[PDB]
């Protein structure tokens, strides 16, 4: 069946290279010596590792990963465990009113510049400025609306007959969920946790407005305010190496899944 299989393989390769090309462009810029970072050529030649060791001769990036993965995978769970209870309630019963959906939608927006404004004033008197007990609070408030609106708007649509059959065989609702809903909602719900981790680990705008010290300097802001360690040399290879080390937890996780 070559008429399908050749086309299908070409498209399967096309999406593979399209998902890689900018990541490979980062790796090539990272590995080119300072003589050839300016060469305008994608394929690297006469490779070096100088930029990586010039980052690792500094605690800044590791301490940024060390704290960022922490806040990211604390919030990706400790928000979602409350998000799931309210999402189940809003799917099963009527707190699922239009006003709860509208409020969750508005907060889903709560564009973070509009939230960091009032917050920054609060933390002039309240303090808690550089420690995690400042950053996580607006993070988790960004991580209940997603992990609520999407979470219910997906698993509430599971077929009624299977829910009737579970009720008729006499299951208690909160245990009927784990035995009959969760095992078949999972391929449509694994994405909710991934999208929240990809947000709670992966925003600059909060930390860029609400951190300064080494305390809680998260990996995105620790690149966005960074520029190459050699003040008298071209910064691009070091920024590229920085971007490269920043990708590592995500690409390792995607290769695990």
């Amino acid at each position: 069946d070559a008429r399908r299989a050749t086309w299908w393989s070409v498209v399967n390769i096309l999406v593979i290279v399209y998902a890689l090309i900018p990541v490979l462009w980062i790796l090539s810029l990272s590995l080119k010596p300072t003589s050839s970072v300016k060469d305008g050529k994608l394929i690297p030649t006469e490779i070096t590792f100088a930029n990586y060791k010039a980052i690792f001769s500094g605690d800044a990036f590791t301490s940024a990963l060390f704290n960022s993965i922490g806040i990211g995978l604390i919030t990706t769970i400790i928000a979602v465990v409350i998000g799931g209870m309210a999402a189940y309630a809003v799917a099963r019963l009527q707190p699922g009113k239009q006003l709860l959906i509208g409020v969750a939608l508005l907060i889903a927006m709560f564009p973070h510049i509009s939230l960091v404004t009032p917050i920054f004033n609060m933390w002039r008197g309240i303090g808690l400025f550089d420690t995690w007990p400042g950053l996580i609070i607006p993070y988790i408030t960004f991580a209940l609306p997603l992990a609520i609106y999407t979470l219910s708007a997906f698993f509430r649509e599971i077929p009624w007959d299977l829910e009737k059959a579970a009720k008729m065989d006499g299951a208690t609702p909160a245990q009927a969920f784990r035995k009959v809903i969760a095992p078949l909602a999972a391929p449509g719900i694994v994405t909710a946790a991934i999208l929240v981790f990809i947000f709670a680990w992966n925003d600059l705008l909060l930390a860029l407005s609400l951190t300064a010290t080494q305390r809680a300097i998260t990996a995105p802001v620790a690149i966005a305010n960074f520029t190459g360690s050699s003040q008298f040399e071209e910064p691009t290879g070091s920024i590229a190496a920085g971007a490269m080390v920043i990708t590592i937890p995500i690409i390792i996780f995607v290769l695990i899944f």
């Binding site: 920054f120 002039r124 010290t213 003040q231 008298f232 040399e233 071209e234």
Partner: protein, 437 residues
């Protein structure tokens, strides 16, 4: 223990980290200076400091704030008056050996709020193999660039062209060198057109900028050129004329002994090997220093800033860094001791010779070996006698943001229309009208 966090510009860290280490060996472990970074471009340094101050950051100890912000940070009470000094020594050490001009920028309404640590007037730089002597005037630069463009060489005139404080230092330098000024001496009144002579200066300055922005074979990236873009372009050999501050040298000789410079390869020379130490400090034996420097004079050179009018010495604008103790800090007396420590004369010497930043203590102009080791010293101190100042008001960063927004993108400037824009926009900034762009 006790730590004084010292904030300085990113691009001023290879000097400041190594001197903070020197000072920590001198203090005897009572307390330590720890160096920290603000952003590269000047306007982003103010942004990041104003956050740390406003958010009551307890870690912030001593600031290298830019020479132009002293009025704002004194008026807001964020930087201490020097009369806060727990030992009573600060106003004396601020006064005793500095210059009249550098020490005057630290005052707002008479009282000092800071102690100078660096000062800088910009210079013209040129490829000495591509032209015999640098032109004394902008029209001469346009001529040499237009000639080099016809001749097919690196004809870019590299200049600060991004919408940032840099772009405004240039405009103030042309206007003050043409004898005009942006604001009155009381800071109350806009002066680009209170009289036709100031307008004539203004439109001439704008027409110069427009001409160099539009000339055949000009840099297509000029509207995005930082000072770092300008320096690199010259280091990449793409520009034959460059207008920057007293820097370059550190990156030049460094990049040359790294072999990154096409016209000055020094990496291939066995006498210059090992010059760059493990932390990246240019540190040759002085015979190798002289070999590398003579090899530089053989191809590359520097000169006093170009005139607007023929036979007029240029009124170059001041730059610099002023230290102050931050109002939020716990370790006030230790921080005042640290400012007096970092301002010592051997660390000033070190700063200029190992880094490029011109020190502000005067006694080094009386040192012949310093006068050899920092070749540009004579023309810096000469230009400083003639220097223009940014217009001192607490309001200033609003004026810089509104004024620069009238000019970018540089190529579109009608001198009459944009003089009108400046007279409106600067008035609007003084009045505090509208959103800042």
């Amino acid at each position: 223990g006790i730590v004084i966090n010292y904030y300085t510009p990113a691009n001023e860290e290879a000097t400041f980290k190594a001197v903070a280490n020197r000072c920590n060996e001198q203090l005897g472990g009572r307390f330590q200076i720890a160096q920290r970074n603000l952003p590269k471009g000047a306007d982003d340094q103010r942004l990041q400091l104003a956050r740390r101050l406003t958010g009551n950051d307890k870690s912030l100890d001593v600031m290298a704030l830019d020479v132009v912000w002293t009025a704002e940070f004194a008026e807001a009470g964020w930087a201490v008056p020097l009369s806060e000094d727990p030992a009573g020594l600060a106003e004396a050490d601020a006064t005793e050996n500095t210059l009249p001009g550098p020490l005057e920028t630290a005052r707002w309404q008479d009282e000092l709020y800071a102690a100078p640590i660096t000062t800088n007037t910009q210079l013209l730089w040129y490829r000495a193999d591509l032209m015999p002597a640098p032109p004394t005037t902008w029209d001469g630069m346009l001529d040499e660039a237009n000639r080099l463009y016809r001749e097919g060489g690196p004809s870019w005139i590299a200049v600060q062209g991004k919408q940032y404080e840099g772009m405004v230092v240039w405009f103030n330098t042309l206007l003050q060198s043409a004898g005009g000024q942006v604001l009155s001496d009381d800071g109350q009144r806009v002066t680009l057109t209170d009289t036709p002579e100031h307008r004539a200066a203004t439109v001439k300055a704008l027409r110069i900028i427009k001409s160099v922005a539009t000339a055949p074979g000009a840099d297509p990236s000029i509207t995005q050129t930082d000072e770092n873009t300008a320096r690199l372009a010259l280091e990449q050999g793409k520009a034959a004329l460059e207008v920057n501050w007293p820097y370059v040298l550190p990156s030049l000789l460094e990049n040359a002994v790294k072999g990154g410079v096409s016209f000055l390869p020094l990496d291939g020379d066995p006498a210059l090997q090992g010059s760059i130490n493990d932390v990246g400090t240019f540190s040759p034996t002085d015979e190798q220093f002289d070999i590398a420097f003579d090899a530089s004079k053989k191809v590359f050179g520097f000169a006093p800033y170009p005139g607007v009018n023929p036979d007029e010495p240029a009124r170059v604008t001041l730059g610099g860094l002023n230290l102050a103790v931050a109002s939020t800090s716990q370790h006030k007396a230790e921080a005042f001791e640290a400012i007096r420590c970092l301002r010592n004369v051997e660390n000033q010497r070190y700063t200029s010779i190992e880094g490029g930043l011109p020190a502000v203590r005067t006694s080094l102009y009386d040192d012949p070996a310093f006068q050899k080791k920092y070749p540009q010293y004579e023309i810096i101190r000469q230009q400083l006698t003639n220097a223009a100042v940014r217009p001192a008001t607490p309001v200033y960063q609003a004026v810089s943001t509104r004024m620069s927004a009238t000019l970018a993108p540089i190529s579109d400037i009608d001198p009459e229309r944009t003089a009108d824009e400046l007279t409106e926009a600067v008035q609007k900034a003084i009045d505090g009208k509208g959103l800042i762009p």
